[PDB]
Amino acid sequence: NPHFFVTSELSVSKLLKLRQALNSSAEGRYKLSVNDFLIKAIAVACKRVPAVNSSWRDGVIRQFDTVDVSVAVATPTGLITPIVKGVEAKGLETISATVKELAKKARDGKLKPEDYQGGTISISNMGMNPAVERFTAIINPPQAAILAVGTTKKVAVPVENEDGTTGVEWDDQIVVTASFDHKVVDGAVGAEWMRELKKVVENPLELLL
Amino acid sequence: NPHFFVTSELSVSKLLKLRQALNSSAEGRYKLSVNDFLIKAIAVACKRVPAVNSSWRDGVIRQFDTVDVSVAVATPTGLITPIVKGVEAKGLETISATVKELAKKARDGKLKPEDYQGGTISISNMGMNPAVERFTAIINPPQAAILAVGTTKKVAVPVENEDGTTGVEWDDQIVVTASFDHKVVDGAVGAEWMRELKKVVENPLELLL
Amino acid sequence: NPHFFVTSELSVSKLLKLRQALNSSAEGRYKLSVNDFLIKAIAVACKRVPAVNSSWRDGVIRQFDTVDVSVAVATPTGLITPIVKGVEAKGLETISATVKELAKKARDGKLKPEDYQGGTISISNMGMNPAVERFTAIINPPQAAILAVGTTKKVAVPVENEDGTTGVEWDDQIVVTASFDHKVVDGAVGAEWMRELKKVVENPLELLL
Amino acid sequence: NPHFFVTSELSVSKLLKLRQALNSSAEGRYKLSVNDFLIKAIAVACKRVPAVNSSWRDGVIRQFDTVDVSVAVATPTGLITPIVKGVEAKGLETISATVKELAKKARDGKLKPEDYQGGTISISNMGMNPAVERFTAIINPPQAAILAVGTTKKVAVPVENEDGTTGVEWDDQIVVTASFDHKVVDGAVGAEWMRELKKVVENPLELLL
């Protein structure tokens, strides 16, 4: 299993501003987190290039026209992978309610058994606790790509103010990792998908596009 | 062998201050290095959560109540793994003398043959030379986790001084990597162990705890 | 295949200055890129320590006195690995012309079939597009080490000006990754090769050495 | 029974600072008092010189390699001596929990009968109430040394400030007393043990040593 690890580095301050604005405008019917924006962005990204969201059979490979995103949730019994289907068609409040409902279902017991079967990309995120920057779980056998998300730190970013020739103003910054299979997805298309994903995420206004 | 790589990023300036104070107070009977603090901290960390320090047999797994730490040393013949046992009970001067004596034994020849058998976590550190930030040797077959340590760089860290709204003051910072097995230790407990390890190391005053 | 991933972090501003000077002095007969300096530097580095540029047969291993560098190029059909031989003897303009000619040959069709066989280290570099910092393709079967190159970012670097006690002046900085085999090349010699490679690259004036 | 009384005078302000720091950093799982630092320090001190922690049989004497510390607790029924074993191996939070649990066990009733047998040095401390500076209970028959602790007062300590040729700044100060047997432990080794104990306690940073 030749799984090569690529990475990217994303600026999220715009996402924080948008999340705060939407949460303040909310009347309580929905709750938003950064994982919501990440899953919507990666759904749009997979719509952009369908190469990443494929599967490998015995010899032959199959490509999915639609997008099905599996999210990892931590349970005392082990690792659970709830699924959400048709993410591109849905908004972000609906997927928010779906993921929180699936999480609480995992808390109170076991889920309906076909919530485990299916999917195109597996997503894991321990950004809640600190002391984690990079990680990559093994790719699931029916999958072809896994995207892992670390925590958000606070580092200096290039700025070109006039009074200060160099200038230093700080921004929040996050690290993502992607493990592919190299049997279906090669390095070039993975780098393309990552760069266009960063292009989508850096300015969130194109999420509605 | 699904070995997933997690990482953390540690501040060591407090450790440097403590090491300098103890070395100045020393009368020559003991010599201290950063590896000493790392091995003591990880011993306490394994005491905190015993899940990481286990082993896998044919099908069944075995959990060790005590801690046995194997340290990697570079030799012209190859790679050697001296062992230290009961690290949690011992202080740091005793383990310091033990590791330096084992290192010089490796220099002058071969060791007693049962110094190779046993252990719970393997530790490797090439922080002596520069030009290394991340690395991860393969996990030893009777082990379940390996922690590798890079070098210490000097980077900017968040500060909240009054005169400067952003403010910039620099600190030394180190990178650690952890390769687990995923047959015994899953991602969640590994992240827990790493975050509590960083909590222990960041302020060294809890080492005596 | 126990492929352990080591990394380094290089300052390239001197290389940019030298590249700009040589390109301005050029009359059009040659074109220079950062990949040229990297391949020349790694050729000299392999000349420094011949351990990395070896191959593994069935049980026995073979060491190459000369250097043969294979460079990866992205093609719509897939991944292509043109080869350049005797790089240490040649300058940098000759290897520049050779690599650009091989790239355009890959563009317009297929190459002469023995351009695929041979080599000591495989080099891949997607530094052209942004949104990539670390990656590592699997080592080719007749090879023993692969060096991957990310993009160049702009980060703060330690400075010791008098007026500012800390001081902050920024520099361009690049990330490199190295995947070895651990059947032939162990961690120590890999770290040695990486540190001496960084020593060569940081100040490019030793390239002519 | 020729029990000669030696004494020492200790500065504890550093211990108060360390205790306050650790208690503030505590999340409630442990509670620390000065007696904890004293018992850990004397355990390390007995490890330093094993002469004090011995016992006398009929004619012959026996020396203990390990350390077992008996602490005196005041009960309405009389005087009770709970025991803690292997103190040097354990930290200070574990012995803290052990001593508080033994104290509350003495409060709610009688203890398991073998908690009375064994030990190397008996420790008594009425530092809680004021109006006590020196005291010394008789040595227990199977013991060879008893260390009693008074209360902490506030007295002037030598200082060498520049503006004030003499200078006066005040510090907290405690008095300790030691009654030996003179059948096993003579004056010289007792004075050695006391001076090295004061050396350990005055700067608590060597407790982790």
Numbering used by the authors:
A (entry chain A), B (entry chain A), C (entry chain A), D (entry chain A): 251 to 459
Pull verbatim passages from the article behind this deposition.
The eukaryotic pyruvate dehydrogenase complex (PDHc), as the most studied family member, is composed of multiple copies of the E1, E2, E3BP (also known as protein X), and E3 enzymes, which all work in concert to perform the dedicated pyruvate oxidation reaction. Architecturally, the core consists of 60 subunits that form a near-symmetric icosahedral structure, formed by 20 trimeric subunits at each corner. In fungi, the core-forming subunit is exclusively E218, whereas in mammals the core is composed of a mixture of E2 and E3BP in either a 48:1219 or 40:20 E2:E3BP ratio. The E2 active site binds CoA and catalyzes the transacetylase reaction, in which the acetyl group from the N6-lipoyllysine, located in the peripheral LD of E2 and E3BP, is transferred onto the thiol group of CoA.
Here, we report a cryo-EM structure of the fully active Chaetomium thermophilum pyruvate dehydrogenase complex (PDHc) core scaffold at 3.85 Å resolution (FSC = 0.143) from native cell extracts. The reconstruction of the core with an application of icosahedral symmetry was resolved at 3.85 Å resolution (FSC = 0.143), where the backbone is clearly traceable and side chain resolution is often visible. The overall icosahedral core is stabilized by two interfaces with distinct energetic signatures, which were calculated with HADDOCK. In particular, the intra-trimeric interface, buries a large surface area of ~5000 Å², while the inter-trimeric interface buries only ~1500 Å2. Inside this cavity, three arginines with a modeled distance of 3.26 Å are visible. We cannot rule out, that this close proximity is a result of averaging, but we suspect the existence of an arginine cluster. Another structural feature is a loop element facing inside the core cavity formed by residues Val405-Trp420, and maybe potentially critical for the organization of the PDHc core scaffold. Flexible regions were first detected above the E2 active site. A previously described backfolded structural element is not seen in the native PDHc core scaffold structure, allowing increased accessibility to the LD to be accommodated in the E2 active site.
